[PDB]
Amino acid sequence: MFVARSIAADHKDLIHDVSFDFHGRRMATCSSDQSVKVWDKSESGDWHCTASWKTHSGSVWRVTWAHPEFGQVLASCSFDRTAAVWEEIVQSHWVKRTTLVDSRTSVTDVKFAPKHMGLMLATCSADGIVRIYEAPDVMNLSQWSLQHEISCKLSCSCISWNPSSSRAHSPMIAVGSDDSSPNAMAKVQIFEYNENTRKYAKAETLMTVTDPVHDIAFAPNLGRSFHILAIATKDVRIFTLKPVGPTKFEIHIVAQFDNHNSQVWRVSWNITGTVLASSGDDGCVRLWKANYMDNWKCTGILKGNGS
């Protein structure tokens, strides 16, 4: 249910990902050529780049954006086992704040936290530990306190958490896996931070997923009574948790779609948590809208180029 038009953008090497701003103005790209870009749309609708530089002696594949309530901030994951937290200075000088090199193995993911706990970065690294960074004093951005870590005992693949800012929800972390050895067990485990214990303890385990998951994306709360997960292991398995010391949540798998039949690339929920803009390995990446009977049926298809 769309008309596809190709944007007028030119990145040097092969692109990796696109993040997006809050109000819907400025993205951030990557390449296997150690380059990033930010394109502010003109009032006429045209896109023009405004900055670029060299990132690291490897490839940067997980650039990300921040919230305007802290100014302007970016971050990225690369070969250097560090997060490039670069802010804007105003022709603008995009250099400030130090690196976060604290990982012995390769970093897997990099994402920010909801805007109701301040700045809280988190990074999960390859063969093990997941790691969260915080800084109370946001007047200078070069300080960063770890204070919390985990031990997933597997090759983490993707991270996510729910923007639900309700006072009645404990913050939770969802982790992906990548092990594909000739055995089956777990690939997505859910965490939950406490207050008195101050520990992210383990609560649940989706014991029906065994394929090499590639991305995890919660659905924004917006006011529902339950959360929504999203996996890309073998078939866009949209899960659904419901609370009923751990919070024993009843699981109800409401999605199994074979359309990709692939190693599906990425999954990304929308602003209001209704349309699941999915993607995959083979070809055109579809949508999965909603129906009157709470039915998840594909409602659009658009091809990787001029379609």
Partner 1 sequence: KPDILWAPHHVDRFVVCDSELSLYHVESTVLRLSEDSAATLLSINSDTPYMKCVAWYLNYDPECLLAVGQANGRVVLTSLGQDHNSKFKDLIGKEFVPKHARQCNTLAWNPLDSNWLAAGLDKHRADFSVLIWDICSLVTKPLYELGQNDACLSLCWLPRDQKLLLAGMHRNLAIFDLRNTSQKMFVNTKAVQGVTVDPYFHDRVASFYEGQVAIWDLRKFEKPVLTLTEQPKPLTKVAWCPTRTGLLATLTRDSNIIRLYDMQHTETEPTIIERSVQPCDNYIASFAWHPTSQNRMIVVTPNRTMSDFTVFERISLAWSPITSLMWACGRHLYECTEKDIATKMRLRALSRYGLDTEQVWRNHILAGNEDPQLKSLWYTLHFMKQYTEDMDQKSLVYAGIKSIVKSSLGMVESSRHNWSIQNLNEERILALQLCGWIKKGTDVDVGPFLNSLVQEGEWERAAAVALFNLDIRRAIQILNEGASSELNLNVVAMALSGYTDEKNSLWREMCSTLRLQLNNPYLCVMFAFLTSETGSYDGVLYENKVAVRDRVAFACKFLSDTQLNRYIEKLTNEMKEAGNLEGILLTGLTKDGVDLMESYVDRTGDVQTASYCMLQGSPLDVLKDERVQYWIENYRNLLDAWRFWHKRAEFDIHRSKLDPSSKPLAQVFVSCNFCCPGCRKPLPRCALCLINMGTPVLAQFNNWFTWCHNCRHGGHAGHMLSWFRDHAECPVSACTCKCMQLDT
Query: Which of 263, 208, 190 minimizes the C-alpha distance to 232?
Result: 263
Subset of 123-162 contacting partner 1 (CB under 8 A): none
Stretch that binds partner 1, among 11-19, 93-101, 132-140, 202-210 (CB under 8 A): 11-19
Residue 160 to residue 68: CA distance in whole angstroms: 21
* Beta carbon nearer to partner 1, 214 or 237: 214
Stretch that binds partner 1, among 170-178, 179-187, 199-207, 276-284 (CB under 8 A): 276-284
* Beta carbon nearer to partner 1, 92 or 147: 92
Tokens 């965490």 label which residue? 191
Note whether 294 binds partner 1 by CB under 8 A: yes
Query: Which of 216, 197, 226 minimizes the C-alpha distance to 276?
Result: 216
Note whether 226 binds partner 1 by CB under 8 A: yes
**Of positions 50, 165, 180, 194, contacts partner 1 by CB under 8 A:** 165
Count of residues in the chain:
307
Residue 127 to residue 107: CA distance in whole angstroms: 9
**Of positions 48, 153, 199, 224, contacts partner 1 by CB under 8 A:** 224
**Of positions 166, 180, 194, 256, contacts partner 1 by CB under 8 A:** 166
Stretch that binds partner 1, among 95-103, 166-174, 204-212, 230-238 (CB under 8 A): 166-174
Residue 120 to residue 161: CA distance in whole angstroms: 12
250 φψ region: left (φ > 0), alpha (ψ -120 to 50), beta (else): beta
* Beta carbon nearer to partner 1, 72 or 177: 72
| Beta-carbon count within 10 A of 132 CB | 19
Note whether 289 binds partner 1 by CB under 8 A: yes
Note whether 7 binds partner 1 by CB under 8 A: yes
Binding mask 86-125 for partner 1 (x = CB under 8 A): ----x---------------x-------------------
Note whether 2 binds partner 1 by CB under 8 A: yes
Tokens 């990099």 label which residue? 110
Q: Which two tokens stand for residue 224?
A: 């529902």
Rg (C-alpha) for the chain, rounded Å, is 19
Stretch that binds partner 1, among 23-31, 147-155, 201-209, 227-235 (CB under 8 A): 23-31
Residues that bind partner 1 (rule: CB under 8 A) add up to a total of: 60
Note whether 10 binds partner 1 by CB under 8 A: yes
Note whether 275 binds partner 1 by CB under 8 A: yes
Contacts of 19 (CB under 8 A, 6+ apart): 27, 28, 63, 64, 65
Contact predicate 78/86, CB 8 Å:
no
What single-letter DSSP state applies at residue 69? Answer: G
Angle at 167 between CA 163 and CA 169, to 5 degrees: 60
Contacts of 268 (CB under 8 A, 6+ apart): 215, 217, 276, 277, 278, 279
Q: How far is the CB of 193 from partner 1 (least distance, A)?
A: 20
Residues that bind partner 1 (CB under 8 A): 1-7, 9-11, 14-20, 22-24, 27, 29, 32, 58-59, 79, 90, 106, 165-168, 221-226, 263, 265-275, 277, 279, 281, 285, 289, 294, 302, 304-306
